[PDB]
Amino acid sequence: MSEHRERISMINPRVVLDENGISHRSRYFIMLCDNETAIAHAKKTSIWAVKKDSSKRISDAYKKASVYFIFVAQQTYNALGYAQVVSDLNSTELPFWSDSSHAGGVRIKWIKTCNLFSAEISEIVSHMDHGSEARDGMEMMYDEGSRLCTLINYAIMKRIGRDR
RNA sequence: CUUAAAC
């Protein structure tokens, strides 16, 4: 994490971080996608099924923070987009594709969608778990989430990796 | 206008 100085982001010095490099106001989770149908449907319908392992932390983060999902292909590490979580976990509105690994659904608001290869994105994702590959549904640091948002935005504005 | 958000 950032060792900039109390602890602050290395991208924006006004963002104060906890001792895990997380901002209490803006929080970021990686969704590793291995199912073309699921990601395709989520891009059309803006509903996502949340894995049981990550569901409680995501739900708790939603209480007091803006919460974002960053979608990455598990096998290729292509960035698929990012979205804000705009509903808490619920059992009322589930995607048809959810199964026993999922706790329930959330509504998302897509900010960007893409199918993007970026070697910096790949390197971030490869080292996201304290230097090892990202685990599905893990929270990342403020600066990782911000940098990924920036890279996706940059690619899109350069007309690279667009899906629309 | 596929303009990250927040600060």
Q: Which CATH number does the domain housing residue A1 bear?
A: 3.10.590.10
How many angstroms separate the Cα of A66 from the Cα of each of A5, A16, A30, A73, A123?
23, 15, 15, 23, 25
Q: For residue A5, say whether its CB is under 7 Å from any atom of strand B.
A: no
Domain count, chain A: 1
Distance, CA of A34 to C1' of B6, in Å: 31
94-113 of chain A touching strand B, CB 7 A cut-off: 111-113
A153 CA to centre of own chain: 14
Q: Are A103 and A148 in contact (CB under 8 A)?
A: no
How far apart, in Å, do the first and last CA atoms of chain A sit? 34
> Solving technique for this entry?
X-ray
Overall resolution, Å: 1.8
Distance, CA of A75 to C1' of B7, in Å: 36
Domain coverage including residue A76? 1-164
Nearest to A68 by CA among A25, A97, A132, A19: A25
Q: Are A83 and A68 in contact (CB under 8 A)?
A: yes
What is the residue whose two structure tokens read 């073309």? A36
A32 CA to centre of own chain: 9
Q: For residue A12, say whether its CB is under 7 Å from any atom of strand B.
A: yes
